[PDB]
Structures are given as structure tokens and as C-alpha cells.
Amino acid sequence: CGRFAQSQTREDYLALLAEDIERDIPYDPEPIGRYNVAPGTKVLLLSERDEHLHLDPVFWGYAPGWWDKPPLINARVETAATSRMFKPLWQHGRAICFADGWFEWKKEGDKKQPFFIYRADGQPIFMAAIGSTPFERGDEAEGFLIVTAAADQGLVDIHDRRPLVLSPEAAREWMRQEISGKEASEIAASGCVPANQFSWHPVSRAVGNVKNQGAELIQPVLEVLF
């Protein structure tokens, strides 16, 4: 999930999670408009502090000062809660990154064909994230990661991993500061959306170029024309 789409208005996503009384997020009618969100950019990230939901632009990536590789962008659900590197983020830096769907590139010989993956029921996805608090500082090295899970069923045809997507109800509980890391591990297990809830189709190769951000990037295409 090295790219995803976050294109609709804030209300389009937040209405599934909480009414205004629970938010500390200004009204804004403008669609976010990003059909091709990439690592290293700041992404509107949802979290809870001071008993309200906040939406902060947070660097997609995590690279402590001691980390000598490109920033990580994912953390595996299998191990993140006990990882020496991720355990504090699992306990104190949980967040949600909402989106319309995500992209994966399927290997077809020496060619790589992009696919867009989304909920068959037409809801947005609430991706489980962990990251470095305080999110509002706008850090440019230690931001957030998208938690991943194994692909199963038809999704394995496309790629072997996928974002850990939570139900709206589970996403709301995941963000609460009052629940422990152990409780969060239970939420991740019980609230994960299974693979048969997703649909997918090939899309234009143009999504590979981050200059492109338009709605055409999630439209289905014939592979034969690419």
C-alpha cells in the first residue's frame, strides 16, 4: 500500500465516525482531492487527544535519528505491539488514516500493473495507523505508519500484504487514549475488515507518477491497453 486515495470532503469520512460534538476539526467543504497520496508527504491523519478527534497533517513515514534507511511506511500487525521499535507507538500513537482505497502493483513478467482496491460496499476505509506523538508538531522524519495485515482470498493475486482496515466502530475505539495497547491489539483482531469485503480493478499506469492526482487514476482500465 505504497499509494492510496484520499479525495473526498472531510465530512464524507468523519460522518461515519463522530458528530461535531466529539470533534475539534474546523468545518471545510473543499474535497481533499488527493487521488495519489505518496510516502514522505504530509497526510491528514485522525487521532484523539483532549477527548476530541483531531485532524493533523502528518508526515507519512517513520525514521528515528538512529535509523539509517529510508523511512518505514508500514508496521506489521503480527509484531508491532511487541516490537522494540513500534511498541510505544502502538500504546500512545494510534491514529486512523481514512481513504477511498489503496493501490498495489501486480507483477506481470517484467511489467508492473497498478490496481485500485476498495470496499465493495462503497464505504471509505479507515486504515489503522501508529505514529509519533505529538502529531501537531509537523515532524518531517517521525510521522505515522500504516499497519498491515496478510492478504488472503482473491487479494493475494494482487499483492501479499494490505492495510489493516477497521470498521467505523472499531476505528473509533482504536483511537481512544483510555484503552491500553493490549486492548488495541484486541480491537485490531476483532475489528479488521476481511478480504472478501474488497473489490479491485486495474487502473492506468499514470498513477505511478506522483505529479498525477486526478479522479481518472482510480477508474477501471483494460490491461491490454497498458
PDB file of C-alpha atoms in Angstrom:
ATOM      1  CA  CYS A   1       0.000   0.000   0.000  1.00  0.00           C
ATOM      2  CA  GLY A   2       2.632   2.459  -1.125  1.00  0.00           C
ATOM      3  CA  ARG A   3      -0.031   4.804  -2.530  1.00  0.00           C
ATOM      4  CA  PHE A   4      -3.682   5.440  -1.715  1.00  0.00           C
ATOM      5  CA  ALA A   5      -6.533   7.842  -2.489  1.00  0.00           C
ATOM      6  CA  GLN A   6      -7.877  10.441  -0.037  1.00  0.00           C
ATOM      7  CA  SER A   7     -10.080  12.504  -2.308  1.00  0.00           C
ATOM      8  CA  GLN A   8     -13.434  13.381  -0.724  1.00  0.00           C
ATOM      9  CA  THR A   9     -14.501  16.039   1.768  1.00  0.00           C
ATOM     10  CA  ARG A  10     -13.615  15.756   5.435  1.00  0.00           C
ATOM     11  CA  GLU A  11     -17.303  15.280   6.275  1.00  0.00           C
ATOM     12  CA  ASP A  12     -17.577  12.380   3.821  1.00  0.00           C
ATOM     13  CA  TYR A  13     -15.162  10.457   6.072  1.00  0.00           C
ATOM     14  CA  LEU A  14     -15.881  11.880   9.522  1.00  0.00           C
ATOM     15  CA  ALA A  15     -19.670  11.387   9.343  1.00  0.00           C
ATOM     16  CA  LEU A  16     -19.155   7.634   9.739  1.00  0.00           C
ATOM     17  CA  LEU A  17     -17.141   8.141  12.958  1.00  0.00           C
ATOM     18  CA  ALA A  18     -18.389  11.012  15.125  1.00  0.00           C
ATOM     19  CA  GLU A  19     -20.653  14.054  15.180  1.00  0.00           C
ATOM     20  CA  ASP A  20     -19.372  17.612  15.692  1.00  0.00           C
ATOM     21  CA  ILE A  21     -19.610  17.481  19.495  1.00  0.00           C
ATOM     22  CA  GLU A  22     -16.811  14.876  19.502  1.00  0.00           C
ATOM     23  CA  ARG A  23     -14.598  16.775  17.046  1.00  0.00           C
ATOM     24  CA  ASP A  24     -12.069  19.580  17.279  1.00  0.00           C
ATOM     25  CA  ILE A  25     -11.787  19.870  13.480  1.00  0.00           C
ATOM     26  CA  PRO A  26     -12.891  23.050  11.635  1.00  0.00           C
ATOM     27  CA  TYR A  27     -15.603  22.754   9.021  1.00  0.00           C
ATOM     28  CA  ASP A  28     -14.123  22.737   5.496  1.00  0.00           C
ATOM     29  CA  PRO A  29     -16.233  21.916   2.410  1.00  0.00           C
ATOM     30  CA  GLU A  30     -13.330  21.521  -0.029  1.00  0.00           C
ATOM     31  CA  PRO A  31     -12.649  17.959  -1.224  1.00  0.00           C
ATOM     32  CA  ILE A  32      -9.201  16.806  -0.136  1.00  0.00           C
ATOM     33  CA  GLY A  33      -8.687  15.899  -3.792  1.00  0.00           C
ATOM     34  CA  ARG A  34      -5.637  13.622  -3.483  1.00  0.00           C
ATOM     35  CA  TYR A  35      -6.144  10.542  -5.620  1.00  0.00           C
ATOM     36  CA  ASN A  36      -2.429   9.557  -5.352  1.00  0.00           C
ATOM     37  CA  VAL A  37      -1.127  10.015  -1.779  1.00  0.00           C
ATOM     38  CA  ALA A  38       2.572   9.116  -1.521  1.00  0.00           C
ATOM     39  CA  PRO A  39       5.053   8.435   1.310  1.00  0.00           C
ATOM     40  CA  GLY A  40       7.057  11.400   2.521  1.00  0.00           C
ATOM     41  CA  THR A  41       4.147  13.786   2.043  1.00  0.00           C
ATOM     42  CA  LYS A  42       2.065  15.025   4.918  1.00  0.00           C
ATOM     43  CA  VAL A  43      -1.343  13.360   5.095  1.00  0.00           C
ATOM     44  CA  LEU A  44      -4.401  14.412   7.033  1.00  0.00           C
ATOM     45  CA  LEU A  45      -4.350  11.954   9.953  1.00  0.00           C
ATOM     46  CA  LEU A  46      -7.137  11.436  12.505  1.00  0.00           C
ATOM     47  CA  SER A  47      -6.442  10.917  16.207  1.00  0.00           C
ATOM     48  CA  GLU A  48      -7.903  11.614  19.639  1.00  0.00           C
ATOM     49  CA  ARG A  49      -6.480  13.985  22.238  1.00  0.00           C
ATOM     50  CA  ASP A  50      -8.163  16.152  24.885  1.00  0.00           C
ATOM     51  CA  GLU A  51     -11.255  13.887  24.473  1.00  0.00           C
ATOM     52  CA  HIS A  52     -11.884  15.078  20.888  1.00  0.00           C
ATOM     53  CA  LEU A  53     -10.955  13.964  17.403  1.00  0.00           C
ATOM     54  CA  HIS A  54      -8.220  15.992  15.720  1.00  0.00           C
ATOM     55  CA  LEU A  55      -7.100  16.063  12.092  1.00  0.00           C
ATOM     56  CA  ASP A  56      -3.415  16.938  11.625  1.00  0.00           C
ATOM     57  CA  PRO A  57      -1.175  16.941   8.516  1.00  0.00           C
ATOM     58  CA  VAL A  58       1.344  14.227   9.415  1.00  0.00           C
ATOM     59  CA  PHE A  59       4.416  13.003   7.513  1.00  0.00           C
ATOM     60  CA  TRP A  60       3.799   9.518   6.088  1.00  0.00           C
ATOM     61  CA  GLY A  61       6.961   7.750   7.195  1.00  0.00           C
ATOM     62  CA  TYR A  62       8.898   6.932  10.336  1.00  0.00           C
ATOM     63  CA  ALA A  63      12.668   7.291  10.680  1.00  0.00           C
ATOM     64  CA  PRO A  64      14.232   7.914  14.096  1.00  0.00           C
ATOM     65  CA  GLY A  65      17.608   9.586  14.288  1.00  0.00           C
ATOM     66  CA  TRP A  66      19.266   6.173  14.675  1.00  0.00           C
ATOM     67  CA  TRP A  67      17.539   4.730  11.571  1.00  0.00           C
ATOM     68  CA  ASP A  68      19.889   4.560   8.564  1.00  0.00           C
ATOM     69  CA  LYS A  69      17.405   3.504   5.852  1.00  0.00           C
ATOM     70  CA  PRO A  70      14.567   5.276   4.058  1.00  0.00           C
ATOM     71  CA  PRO A  71      11.676   5.861   6.469  1.00  0.00           C
ATOM     72  CA  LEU A  72       9.409   2.918   7.126  1.00  0.00           C
ATOM     73  CA  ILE A  73       5.854   3.371   5.868  1.00  0.00           C
ATOM     74  CA  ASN A  74       4.195   0.215   7.279  1.00  0.00           C
ATOM     75  CA  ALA A  75       4.234  -1.789  10.502  1.00  0.00           C
ATOM     76  CA  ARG A  76       3.169  -5.436  10.533  1.00  0.00           C
ATOM     77  CA  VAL A  77       0.191  -6.172  12.801  1.00  0.00           C
ATOM     78  CA  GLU A  78       1.712  -9.561  13.645  1.00  0.00           C
ATOM     79  CA  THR A  79       4.510  -7.968  15.664  1.00  0.00           C
ATOM     80  CA  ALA A  80       4.042  -4.194  16.011  1.00  0.00           C
ATOM     81  CA  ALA A  81       2.627  -4.235  19.549  1.00  0.00           C
ATOM     82  CA  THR A  82       5.694  -6.062  20.951  1.00  0.00           C
ATOM     83  CA  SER A  83       8.335  -4.626  18.589  1.00  0.00           C
ATOM     84  CA  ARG A  84      11.135  -2.732  20.297  1.00  0.00           C
ATOM     85  CA  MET A  85      10.704  -0.061  17.616  1.00  0.00           C
ATOM     86  CA  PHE A  86       6.899   0.145  17.445  1.00  0.00           C
ATOM     87  CA  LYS A  87       5.576  -0.768  20.916  1.00  0.00           C
ATOM     88  CA  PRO A  88       5.483   2.864  22.177  1.00  0.00           C
ATOM     89  CA  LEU A  89       3.661   3.928  19.009  1.00  0.00           C
ATOM     90  CA  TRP A  90       1.173   1.076  19.461  1.00  0.00           C
ATOM     91  CA  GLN A  91       0.499   2.246  23.022  1.00  0.00           C
ATOM     92  CA  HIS A  92       0.424   6.039  22.654  1.00  0.00           C
ATOM     93  CA  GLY A  93       0.457   6.957  18.979  1.00  0.00           C
ATOM     94  CA  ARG A  94      -2.527   5.155  17.497  1.00  0.00           C
ATOM     95  CA  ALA A  95      -4.390   7.020  14.750  1.00  0.00           C
ATOM     96  CA  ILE A  96      -6.647   6.451  11.756  1.00  0.00           C
ATOM     97  CA  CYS A  97      -5.883   7.385   8.158  1.00  0.00           C
ATOM     98  CA  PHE A  98      -9.107   7.488   6.172  1.00  0.00           C
ATOM     99  CA  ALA A  99      -9.090   6.869   2.421  1.00  0.00           C
ATOM    100  CA  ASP A 100     -11.173   5.795  -0.549  1.00  0.00           C
ATOM    101  CA  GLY A 101      -8.975   2.795  -1.290  1.00  0.00           C
ATOM    102  CA  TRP A 102      -5.358   1.922  -1.935  1.00  0.00           C
ATOM    103  CA  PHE A 103      -3.123   0.942  -4.854  1.00  0.00           C
ATOM    104  CA  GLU A 104      -0.945  -2.121  -5.416  1.00  0.00           C
ATOM    105  CA  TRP A 105       1.240  -3.045  -8.369  1.00  0.00           C
ATOM    106  CA  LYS A 106       0.866  -6.617  -9.628  1.00  0.00           C
ATOM    107  CA  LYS A 107       3.948  -8.144 -11.213  1.00  0.00           C
ATOM    108  CA  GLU A 108       3.194  -9.431 -14.738  1.00  0.00           C
ATOM    109  CA  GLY A 109       6.510 -10.548 -16.175  1.00  0.00           C
ATOM    110  CA  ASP A 110       8.871  -7.595 -16.096  1.00  0.00           C
ATOM    111  CA  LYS A 111       5.816  -5.294 -16.179  1.00  0.00           C
ATOM    112  CA  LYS A 112       4.028  -3.899 -13.118  1.00  0.00           C
ATOM    113  CA  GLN A 113       0.291  -3.252 -13.448  1.00  0.00           C
ATOM    114  CA  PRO A 114      -1.396  -0.988 -10.874  1.00  0.00           C
ATOM    115  CA  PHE A 115      -4.707  -1.931  -9.268  1.00  0.00           C
ATOM    116  CA  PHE A 116      -7.084   0.102  -7.114  1.00  0.00           C
ATOM    117  CA  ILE A 117      -8.599  -1.754  -4.149  1.00  0.00           C
ATOM    118  CA  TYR A 118     -11.664  -0.520  -2.264  1.00  0.00           C
ATOM    119  CA  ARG A 119     -14.676  -1.673  -0.238  1.00  0.00           C
ATOM    120  CA  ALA A 120     -17.322  -3.440  -2.327  1.00  0.00           C
ATOM    121  CA  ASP A 121     -19.979  -1.858  -0.096  1.00  0.00           C
ATOM    122  CA  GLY A 122     -18.857   1.632  -1.095  1.00  0.00           C
ATOM    123  CA  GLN A 123     -17.764   2.885   2.335  1.00  0.00           C
ATOM    124  CA  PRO A 124     -14.405   4.624   2.753  1.00  0.00           C
ATOM    125  CA  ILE A 125     -11.668   2.659   4.513  1.00  0.00           C
ATOM    126  CA  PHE A 126     -10.364   3.541   7.968  1.00  0.00           C
ATOM    127  CA  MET A 127      -6.748   2.395   7.989  1.00  0.00           C
ATOM    128  CA  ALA A 128      -5.134   1.613  11.332  1.00  0.00           C
ATOM    129  CA  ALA A 129      -2.060   3.791  11.835  1.00  0.00           C
ATOM    130  CA  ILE A 130       0.574   4.226  14.530  1.00  0.00           C
ATOM    131  CA  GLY A 131       2.896   7.194  14.792  1.00  0.00           C
ATOM    132  CA  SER A 132       4.976   9.652  16.791  1.00  0.00           C
ATOM    133  CA  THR A 133       3.018  11.965  19.107  1.00  0.00           C
ATOM    134  CA  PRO A 134       2.545  14.887  19.342  1.00  0.00           C
ATOM    135  CA  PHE A 135       1.256  14.759  15.782  1.00  0.00           C
ATOM    136  CA  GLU A 136       0.635  18.503  15.649  1.00  0.00           C
ATOM    137  CA  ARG A 137       4.359  19.355  15.651  1.00  0.00           C
ATOM    138  CA  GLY A 138       4.581  18.605  11.921  1.00  0.00           C
ATOM    139  CA  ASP A 139       7.724  16.465  12.157  1.00  0.00           C
ATOM    140  CA  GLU A 140       9.411  15.650   8.860  1.00  0.00           C
ATOM    141  CA  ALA A 141      11.096  12.362   9.879  1.00  0.00           C
ATOM    142  CA  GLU A 142       8.948  10.689  12.573  1.00  0.00           C
ATOM    143  CA  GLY A 143       5.331  10.725  11.398  1.00  0.00           C
ATOM    144  CA  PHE A 144       2.981   7.759  11.008  1.00  0.00           C
ATOM    145  CA  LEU A 145       2.940   4.247   9.571  1.00  0.00           C
ATOM    146  CA  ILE A 146       0.025   2.276   8.143  1.00  0.00           C
ATOM    147  CA  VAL A 147      -0.439  -1.032   9.961  1.00  0.00           C
ATOM    148  CA  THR A 148      -0.518  -4.003   7.578  1.00  0.00           C
ATOM    149  CA  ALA A 149      -2.059  -7.465   7.598  1.00  0.00           C
ATOM    150  CA  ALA A 150      -1.761 -10.521   5.382  1.00  0.00           C
ATOM    151  CA  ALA A 151      -3.726 -10.536   2.164  1.00  0.00           C
ATOM    152  CA  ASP A 152      -5.998 -13.536   1.775  1.00  0.00           C
ATOM    153  CA  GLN A 153      -8.588 -14.925  -0.651  1.00  0.00           C
ATOM    154  CA  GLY A 154      -8.615 -13.177  -4.055  1.00  0.00           C
ATOM    155  CA  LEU A 155      -6.479 -10.269  -2.856  1.00  0.00           C
ATOM    156  CA  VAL A 156      -3.348 -12.465  -2.841  1.00  0.00           C
ATOM    157  CA  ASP A 157      -3.494 -12.412  -6.651  1.00  0.00           C
ATOM    158  CA  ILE A 158      -2.559  -8.723  -6.458  1.00  0.00           C
ATOM    159  CA  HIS A 159      -0.167  -8.418  -3.506  1.00  0.00           C
ATOM    160  CA  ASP A 160       0.712 -10.348  -0.361  1.00  0.00           C
ATOM    161  CA  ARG A 161       0.016  -7.571   2.191  1.00  0.00           C
ATOM    162  CA  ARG A 162      -2.728  -4.996   2.703  1.00  0.00           C
ATOM    163  CA  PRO A 163      -3.542  -2.169   5.120  1.00  0.00           C
ATOM    164  CA  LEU A 164      -5.216  -3.179   8.346  1.00  0.00           C
ATOM    165  CA  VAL A 165      -8.659  -1.701   7.664  1.00  0.00           C
ATOM    166  CA  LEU A 166     -11.012  -1.291  10.636  1.00  0.00           C
ATOM    167  CA  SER A 167     -14.785  -0.993  10.771  1.00  0.00           C
ATOM    168  CA  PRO A 168     -16.028   2.524  11.637  1.00  0.00           C
ATOM    169  CA  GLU A 169     -16.915   1.284  15.118  1.00  0.00           C
ATOM    170  CA  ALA A 170     -13.513  -0.338  15.632  1.00  0.00           C
ATOM    171  CA  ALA A 171     -11.725   2.733  14.245  1.00  0.00           C
ATOM    172  CA  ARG A 172     -13.402   4.923  16.861  1.00  0.00           C
ATOM    173  CA  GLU A 173     -12.351   2.606  19.694  1.00  0.00           C
ATOM    174  CA  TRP A 174      -8.799   2.235  18.315  1.00  0.00           C
ATOM    175  CA  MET A 175      -8.212   5.979  18.651  1.00  0.00           C
ATOM    176  CA  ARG A 176      -9.297   6.290  22.293  1.00  0.00           C
ATOM    177  CA  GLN A 177      -6.479   7.294  24.614  1.00  0.00           C
ATOM    178  CA  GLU A 178      -8.076   5.463  27.558  1.00  0.00           C
ATOM    179  CA  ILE A 179      -7.638   1.958  26.095  1.00  0.00           C
ATOM    180  CA  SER A 180      -4.372   0.083  26.573  1.00  0.00           C
ATOM    181  CA  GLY A 181      -2.064  -1.420  23.977  1.00  0.00           C
ATOM    182  CA  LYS A 182      -3.449  -4.853  24.857  1.00  0.00           C
ATOM    183  CA  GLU A 183      -6.996  -3.595  24.276  1.00  0.00           C
ATOM    184  CA  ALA A 184      -5.833  -2.091  20.980  1.00  0.00           C
ATOM    185  CA  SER A 185      -4.474  -5.498  19.957  1.00  0.00           C
ATOM    186  CA  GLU A 186      -7.927  -6.950  20.656  1.00  0.00           C
ATOM    187  CA  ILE A 187      -9.570  -4.205  18.585  1.00  0.00           C
ATOM    188  CA  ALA A 188      -7.163  -4.868  15.716  1.00  0.00           C
ATOM    189  CA  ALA A 189      -8.072  -8.556  15.855  1.00  0.00           C
ATOM    190  CA  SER A 190     -11.840  -8.132  16.236  1.00  0.00           C
ATOM    191  CA  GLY A 191     -12.388  -5.065  14.035  1.00  0.00           C
ATOM    192  CA  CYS A 192     -10.314  -5.998  10.973  1.00  0.00           C
ATOM    193  CA  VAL A 193     -12.276  -5.989   7.710  1.00  0.00           C
ATOM    194  CA  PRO A 194     -11.853  -9.332   5.906  1.00  0.00           C
ATOM    195  CA  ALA A 195     -10.552  -9.691   2.373  1.00  0.00           C
ATOM    196  CA  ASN A 196     -13.902 -10.715   0.884  1.00  0.00           C
ATOM    197  CA  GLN A 197     -15.207  -7.209   1.616  1.00  0.00           C
ATOM    198  CA  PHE A 198     -12.931  -5.690  -1.041  1.00  0.00           C
ATOM    199  CA  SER A 199     -13.176  -5.262  -4.804  1.00  0.00           C
ATOM    200  CA  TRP A 200     -10.436  -4.219  -7.190  1.00  0.00           C
ATOM    201  CA  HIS A 201      -9.642  -3.472 -10.810  1.00  0.00           C
ATOM    202  CA  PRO A 202      -6.634  -2.443 -12.897  1.00  0.00           C
ATOM    203  CA  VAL A 203      -6.064   1.293 -13.330  1.00  0.00           C
ATOM    204  CA  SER A 204      -3.974   3.470 -15.605  1.00  0.00           C
ATOM    205  CA  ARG A 205      -0.193   3.298 -15.276  1.00  0.00           C
ATOM    206  CA  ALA A 206      -0.274   7.094 -14.785  1.00  0.00           C
ATOM    207  CA  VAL A 207      -0.752   6.646 -11.023  1.00  0.00           C
ATOM    208  CA  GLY A 208       2.922   5.676 -10.846  1.00  0.00           C
ATOM    209  CA  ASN A 209       3.818   9.362 -11.359  1.00  0.00           C
ATOM    210  CA  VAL A 210       3.026  11.392  -8.229  1.00  0.00           C
ATOM    211  CA  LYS A 211       2.519  14.509 -10.344  1.00  0.00           C
ATOM    212  CA  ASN A 212      -0.871  12.983 -11.213  1.00  0.00           C
ATOM    213  CA  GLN A 213      -3.638  13.472  -8.651  1.00  0.00           C
ATOM    214  CA  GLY A 214      -6.882  13.370 -10.667  1.00  0.00           C
ATOM    215  CA  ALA A 215     -10.017  11.252 -10.320  1.00  0.00           C
ATOM    216  CA  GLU A 216      -9.177   9.361 -13.513  1.00  0.00           C
ATOM    217  CA  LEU A 217      -6.465   7.486 -11.585  1.00  0.00           C
ATOM    218  CA  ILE A 218      -8.993   5.200  -9.827  1.00  0.00           C
ATOM    219  CA  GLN A 219     -11.035   4.404 -12.973  1.00  0.00           C
ATOM    220  CA  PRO A 220     -11.005   0.791 -14.257  1.00  0.00           C
ATOM    221  CA  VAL A 221      -8.992   0.125 -17.425  1.00  0.00           C
ATOM    222  CA  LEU A 222      -8.227  -2.747 -19.764  1.00  0.00           C
ATOM    223  CA  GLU A 223      -4.777  -4.165 -19.051  1.00  0.00           C
ATOM    224  CA  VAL A 224      -4.292  -4.758 -22.791  1.00  0.00           C
ATOM    225  CA  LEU A 225      -4.027  -1.007 -23.407  1.00  0.00           C
ATOM    226  CA  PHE A 226      -1.099  -0.629 -20.949  1.00  0.00           C
TER     227      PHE A 226
END
